[PDB]
Amino acid sequence: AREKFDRSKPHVNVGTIGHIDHGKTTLTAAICTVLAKEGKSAATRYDQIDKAPEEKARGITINSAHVEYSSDKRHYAHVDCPGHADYIKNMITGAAQMDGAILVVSATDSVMPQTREHILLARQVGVPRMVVFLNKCDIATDEEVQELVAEEVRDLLTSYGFDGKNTPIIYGSALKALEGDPKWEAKIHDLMNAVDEWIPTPEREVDKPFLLAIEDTMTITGRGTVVTGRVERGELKVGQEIEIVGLRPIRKAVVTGIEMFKKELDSAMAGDNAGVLLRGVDRKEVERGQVLAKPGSIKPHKKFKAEIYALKKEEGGRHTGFLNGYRPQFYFRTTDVTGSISLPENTEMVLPGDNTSITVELIAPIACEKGSKFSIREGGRTVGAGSVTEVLE
C-alpha cells in the first residue's frame, strides 16, 4: 500500500494569514510536532516545510506548501502560503481556496502590511469568523502586553468586518510548543479548542462534475506526470473522463494515479487535495493558474460582464484610479489574469466606492464560473473583489 490516506472526518481546506517566519511557518511546523505525539493522521514536523532545491536555507519561501495535518477532531489542508516580494501572489490567491484562515501573530515579530493585505482580501472574497493565535511567546513578559496587542489586532480585523472580540486570541510559544511542554502543549490545545469552534468544516457535495485549482505538478519516476491541486466540487474517480479547463484549449484525459500529498485517496471527493497521475501528460503542459473539470461543464471564456464594487484606496487601491486602457489582474481562484477594461456606462474611472458593472475580455480562454468571488489588484494594491455576474464569450 502507498499509505492510502484515510478520511474519517470531513476535510477542510484551511490556510493562514499574517506573514511567514513570524512563527507562522514555525506554527505550521510545531502544530504538527505536538500532533504525532498525541494524534492520528497527524504526523510531527520540525523542518519538513520544504521539498525544493535552493529553498531550504534562505528562510523566506517562494512557493506554497500543501500538506495534510489532522487530529481526532479536524483534518486540515495546511498550506504554507508565502507573503513576500513577488511571492504574495502565493498567499493572496490562496485566501480563496483556503476554506479556513488562521491568523498567526507573533509575540516577537509584529503584524506586517502582509497581515493587513491578508485580512483585507479575506474579507473581500468573504469568509466569516476568523481565529487568531499569538505565536512566539517563547520570550517572557506576555501577561499584559497580550492585551494591547490584542486590542490592536482586533482593530486590525475590524478594518474589514470579521468577528471582533468574539474571536479569541490564543496565546502561545511555537518554540516552547515545538520543544514540547505540556502546559505549553495546552496553548496549542486551546488554539485548537478555539479553532474548531467559530470555524466550521465546509461540506462540499460530491456530485457536481469536477473542478480543481491547480497548485503544483510532478512527473514521477517511470509512471509519468502527476498534477496536484484542490478539488473544488464533486468526486474524481476511476479513469475519469476529464478535461483540463481554463487559459487554454480543452483536453480530455484519463487518470493514472491519485494521492493526497503522496498518500493515496480511495475517493477524491469535493474539497480534497488531489494529486492525479494522468495517462500521458507533462508538467510543462500544466502551470500555476490552470483549472480542471469533468466535462459537460463550465467551458473556457474570455469576455464577460462584471457588476463589481471597487476597493477604495483605503481598501488598498492604487494611488490613482484606473482608466479603460488599464490592464488589471482578476483573481480567478488559481490565477491573476491581465484583462481589458470596459467599465459599465456611467463610469470612466472607478473612483473610491463605485459599485460598477464593468465588462472585460481576458487574454486566454478561462472557464468562468458565475458567482466566483474573484479579486482584482495591480501594482501591489487591491482594487476589486467580488462575484462573477454575466457570462460572455
Question: Least distance to RNA from the beta carbon of 48, Å?
Answer: 11
Q: What does the alpha-carbon distance between residue 335 and residue 101 come to, in Å, rounded to a whole number?
A: 20
Q: Is 137 annotated as a binding residue?
A: yes
Q: What does the alpha-carbon distance between residue 28 and residue 268 come to, in Å, rounded to a whole number?
A: 24
Q: Is 319 annotated as a binding residue?
A: no
Does 54 interact with RNA (rule: CB under 7 A)? yes
Does 379 interact with RNA (rule: CB under 7 A)? yes
Question: Least distance to RNA from the beta carbon of 318, Å?
Answer: 5
Does 317 interact with RNA (rule: CB under 7 A)? no
Q: Is 20 annotated as a binding residue?
A: yes
Alpha-carbon Rg for the chain, nearest whole angstrom, is 21
Binding to RNA, residues 237-266 (CB under 7 A): 239, 254, 256
Q: Which of 336, 372, 382, 384 binds RNA (CB under 7 A)?
A: 336
Q: Which of 152, 181, 287, 393 binds RNA (CB under 7 A)?
A: 287
Question: Least distance to RNA from the beta carbon of 190, Å?
Answer: 35
Q: Which stretch binds RNA (CB under 7 A): 28-36, 76-84, 184-192, 334-342?
A: 334-342
Instruction: Tell me the site size for RNA, rule CB under 7 A.
Output: 48
Residues within the interface to RNA (CB under 7 A): 51-55, 62-63, 86, 89, 216-224, 239, 254, 256, 279-280, 282-283, 287-289, 318-323, 325-327, 329, 335-338, 349, 363-364, 378-380
Residue positions forming the annotated binding site: 18-25, 80-84, 135-138
Residue positions forming the annotated binding site for GTP: 18-25, 80-84, 135-138
